[PDB]
Structure formats: structure tokens, C-alpha cells
Amino acid sequence: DISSTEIAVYWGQREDGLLRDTCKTNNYKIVFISFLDKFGCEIRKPELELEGVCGPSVGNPCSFLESQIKECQRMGVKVFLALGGPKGTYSACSADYAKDLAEYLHTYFLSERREGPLGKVALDGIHFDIQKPVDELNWDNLLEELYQIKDVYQSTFLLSAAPGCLSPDEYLDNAIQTRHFDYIFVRFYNDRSCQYSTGNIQRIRNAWLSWTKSVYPRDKNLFLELPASQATAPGGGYIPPSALIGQVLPYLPDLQTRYAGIALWNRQADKETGYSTNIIRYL
């Protein structure tokens, strides 16, 4: 229901502040480190570069994040790695490369087996934010290889996706139809056919309904992903906090069984406007 709302947030830019400080706010239950956005056929060991934060181009190594990640997890926050994003050049390449990449993610990000870009860690999940890939092929293969690895080691990491709000999604529909994601974060912004606007919840309500019908199983596995300010959604979609709580959430069909909470793009925007602070007050 509404009171059990969990909040997620994207993190990975200079203006976001430190990861540790983001967790210690205690506003969030999930944080996406964003993004791993360059990989494809000839890139056997993908590197992480966070703009103005860490990477070979910044002169500060991303492995300094290891202790902050661990502090977050200790205080009950789940830390995901997000693939893809609005920028970069990414592709799953082929059925063979999809196996290579799934093994790479498991060895270096999910099991503490070796030292990787974020140091020696075991993250809580992998998040498919496939907004603008080279093409739509092989994303289902990547998902299915990670799912299989989970069975082999009896691991507990989670798998999630962030499709656009118009079903069926151009890039992730085959993957979503496997029924093997744990969570779906539907992006209700930058699309006039399915987002909120002042005095009209009919299009977002209908789109929520379409997603409850086409996503199985029928668990609490659906989040709304929304912009945390007007500035991070030049295509529209921003919902003021009082309108979210009062005019939108009470009127989503099957809220009781399907709704898991909200995700905010992004941490910088959230700091600037107090979005999640005002939501938490009205819970």
C-alpha cells in the first residue's frame, strides 16, 4: 500500500555528492550506481567511468568506493549497478558475448571473487536501463545468462529493468516476457502518450494498468520512475509531491498487490527540490 513505499534513486555524477552521504540521509532503500555505459563485441573487460567522480579520465580510481558501498549495505541500503543509460555506446553483441559479459559481471561485481572497478564487492543487483542501445537484440540473452548463474551459485542478487511507459517497449519487451526480472521500474516521463500533466491523470493511470496486465508474475514487482524536478524532464512528466500522494497513487488499479514504490531521476535533482523529503512526511 501507500505507507509501505520504498524509494530508489540514481547516483553517479559530481553534483550528487558522496555515495556515503547519500545513504546516511536514510531517505532511500535502493541506490543505482549509474552507469556502466560502454561495452560490446570487442570490449572483453568493460571499465567504469563516472563523470567527474572517478575513472581513468578523472584521476581518481572508482575502487575508492568499496568502503562506502559496504557502509551503505551495512545500514540496510541495496546497491545496484545500472547498465546503459541516456549516453554512451552499448550493445549485448551476440549470444556468445552475452555469456562472457554475464560471467564478467558476476566475477567482478557480484561475488567478491576478484578485485574489479569498484574494488572487491558483492552488489545487490544488476539494473537494465536500456534506453538507447545499438540495437534491440540479445538483451534477453544477457538476462537469461545472469539468471542461470544465479541458480548455479544459489545467489540472492536481484535483476531489474527500466522500460519506457509505452507498452510494448522497443528494446526490453523480449527480455520482460521471460518473466525473470525481479523488479520493473517504468519510466513515466519524456513521453506525452503515457505521462502525467496538470489536471489529467487518465493517461498515466491507463499506462499503469497496461503494465500490470503484461508483467508476470502478479507480485509486488512494479515501481514508478519519475523525475525529481522539472529540469530533469524537458519532455514533461514531473508530478508535484502533493499531486502524487493525493491525486495519482490512490487511483492506480491493483496498487495493493502490485505497487512496490518509486524511483527518482536523479539524486542531484532530489537535493535541489526536497522531493523525497516531502513524500516521506506524507506517508
Residue numbers in the entry: 1 to 283
The authors write:
The European XFEL (EuXFEL) in Germany is the first MHz XFEL. Our results demonstrate that MHz XFELs can be used to collect high-quality serial femtosecond crystallography data, and that under the conditions used in the current experiment, shock waves caused by the interaction between the sample jet and the XFEL pulses do not compromise the data to a measurable extent. We demonstrate here that it is possible to separate the data of the three types of protein crystals in such a microcrystalline mixture of jack bean proteins (urease, concanavalin A and B), and to determine the structures of the two concanavalins, using data collected at the first MHz XFEL. Therefore, now that the first MHz XFEL has become available, we investigated this issue at current EuXFEL operating parameters, using microcrystals of the model protein lysozyme.
As well as addressing the challenges associated with MHz data repetition rates using a model system (lysozyme protein crystals), we investigated a microcrystalline preparation of jack bean proteins precipitated with acetone, a preparation described by James Sumner, who used this technique for the first crystallization of an enzyme (urease) in 192618, resulting in a Nobel Prize in 194619. To this end, we collected SFX data of a microcrystalline mixture of jack bean proteins, crystallized using acetone as published previously. The microcrystalline slurry contained at least three different crystal forms. Due to their small size (on the order of 5–10 μm) the crystals could not be further characterized before the beam time and it thus remained unclear which proteins had in fact crystallized. In contrast to the concanavalin A and B microcrystals, which diffracted strongly, urease microcrystals diffracted only to low resolution and with low signal-to-noise ratio, and no structure was refined. Indeed, the electron density maps are of excellent quality and the overall structures are virtually identical to those determined using macroscopic crystals, with core RMSDs on Cα atoms against reference structures of 0.31 Å for concanavalin A (vs. PDB entry 1JBC30) and 0.24 Å for concanavalin B (vs. PDB entry 1CNV31). Given the lysozyme results, it appears unlikely that our jack bean protein data are compromised by radiation damage or by shock wave effects in the current experiment. As shown by the electron density maps of the concanavalin A and B structures determined in this study, the data are of high quality and this is likely to improve as experience with ultrafast detectors such as the AGIPD increases. Moreover, in just one shift (12 h) of data collection, ~77,000 indexed images were collected of concanavalin A and ~24,000 of concanavalin B, despite this being one of the very first experiments at a new facility.
